[PDB]
Amino acid sequence: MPTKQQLLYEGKAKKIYATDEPDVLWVEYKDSATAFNGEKKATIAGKGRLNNEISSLLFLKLREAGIANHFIEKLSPTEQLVRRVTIIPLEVVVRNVVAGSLAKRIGLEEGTPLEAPLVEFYYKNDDLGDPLLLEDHIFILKLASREEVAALKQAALAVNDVLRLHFAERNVRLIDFKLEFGRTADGAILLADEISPDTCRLWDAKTNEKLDKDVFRRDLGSLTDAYEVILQRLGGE
Amino acid sequence: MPTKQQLLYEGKAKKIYATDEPDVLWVEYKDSATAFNGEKKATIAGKGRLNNEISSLLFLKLREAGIANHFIEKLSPTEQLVRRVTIIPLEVVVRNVVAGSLAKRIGLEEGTPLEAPLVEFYYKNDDLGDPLLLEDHIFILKLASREEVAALKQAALAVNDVLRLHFAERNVRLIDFKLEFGRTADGAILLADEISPDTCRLWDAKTNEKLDKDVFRRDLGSLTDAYEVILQRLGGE
Ligand SMILES: Nc1ncnc2c1ncn2[C@@H]1O[C@H](COP(=O)(O)OP(=O)(O)O)[C@@H](O)[C@H]1O
Numbered sequence A, B: 001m002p003t004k005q006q007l008l009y010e011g012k013a014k015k016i017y018a019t020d021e022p023d024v025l026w027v028e029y030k031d032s033a034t035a036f037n038g039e040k041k042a043t044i045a046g047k048g049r050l051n052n053e054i055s056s057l058l059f060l061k062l063r064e065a066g067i068a069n070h071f072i073e074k075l076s077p078t079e080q081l082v083r084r085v086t087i088i089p090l091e092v093v094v095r096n097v098v099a100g101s102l103a104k105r106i107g108l109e110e111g112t113p114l115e116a117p118l119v120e121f122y123y124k125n126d127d128l129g130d131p132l133l134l135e136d137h138i139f140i141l142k143l144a145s146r147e148e149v150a151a152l153k154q155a156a157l158a159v160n161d162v163l164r165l166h167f168a169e170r171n172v173r174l175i176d177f178k179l180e181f182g183r184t185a186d187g188a189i190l191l192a193d194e195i196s197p198d199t200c201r202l203w204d205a206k207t208n209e210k211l212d213k214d215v216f217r218r219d220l221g222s223l224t225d226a227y228e229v230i231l232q233r234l235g236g237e
């Protein structure tokens, strides 16, 4: 029962519309794919639906698990309603295994194990290439307080506990993932954006087949065929 | 470690080979589909793998739940090892909802509910069209004793309890299914044969989409695409 109103913002993957309710937003997932800081792009038919549906499922699982988030309800195969927040410009990354950009940064082979989950912070500024930030840099930038950063790390690790187990029970290894959080008018914080194969590195527990955006980044095959596997492992739409 | 030996029997869906172990059989699932008492047939690439993998998963779930069965271990994407039994010539059917042949028999629309699961016995004799049998007919034929029939009913309902729930947790409605049981040398009975979309009627809980052999019977689309959904809902191979 909102209704989609004027467009407020259009990013690389989704369109953000305002609704008749001031603190409710209408999110539309596009059938667009991007990689390598936007250097690689393409239209992927059906991608928006897959990510909207998967994101819906994962946020609902988080809600059931007691993890605060902005997801309100799914609206269509490609759209969903969420709580409006003012995003803290940080990409909060959790890595359970060494892979992707981290593997490249330290020169280690993907799959290298970690003693415990690693939390990394990246500046959400595409013009700057979303550079890695030391926590001290966050305070220099005044992006968040020391207590907020500590809370974000705790929140991200809580998300990891829930999702890592959820995926493992479904024969999927949650290698790493990226989260975004936002502030409410009263200063409260809620997990926001998206949680999908675009934002999570997922390997099949048996074959180690890649079922995430790496499929597009490295041209490993059909991106939607891979994402469909995840959707069904999660129980379907 | 048994090794595949001579072919003992080839049915309409699988090939049964003997192994170096007298009480162990080697089952190979074929890429063939049949319907309407063998009146409709076709080769379906990949079907054998899907049924072998799904059957493996379901028998393993049954084993975990404490339900005795002949499944030993999966051998390849299309083959599996099982305990040899002498099959009781009965197709034990459990129906949770009215559909398929039952809907046709009583002239009711598919989907009509039942107060409790219904157990039906069919004579496993394709030359006779696998006719429905009253329990009294079973005794006339001397196929099984009254105590065995009672035990088979209990066993089938126990399988329904476990599988109905397992599928429901994965957004799949187990509409009905057919089982086969066999006797060991000492008179013990084990659930045998197969448990797959070929032998189970499965509807998606949300869309009621048919994800079983009805897809082939009624030409509703790709049979393997439908079966793949079930495989992934169950956690993948
Ligand atoms: N609940 C929310 N309230 C306000 N902004 C949000 C919320 N969740 C996500 N966003 C923002 O909406 C955008 C999502 O689109 P994309 O993810 O397509 O944008 P980018 O392309 O990330 O800017 C991001 O800028 C993200 O920070």
Ligand SMILES: Nc1ncnc2c1ncn2[C@@H]1O[C@H](COP(=O)(O)OP(=O)(O)O)[C@@H](O)[C@H]1O
Binding pocket: B009, B010, B011, B012, B013, B014, B015, B016, B025, B070, B082, B083, B084, B085, B086, B087, B180, B182, B192, B193, B194
């Ligand atoms: N564990 C088992 N031991 C011996 N026979 C079995 C066992 N499980 C199934 N069978 C039989 O093997 C055959 C399976 O192939 P299909 O299912 O292709 O045969 P039909 O085509 O049903 O005879 C059936 O006749 C079935 O009754």
Ligand SMILES: [Mg+2]
Binding pocket: A011, A013, A193
């Ligand atoms: Mg984004």
Ligand SMILES: [Mg+2]
Binding pocket: B011, B013
């Ligand atoms: Mg058979």
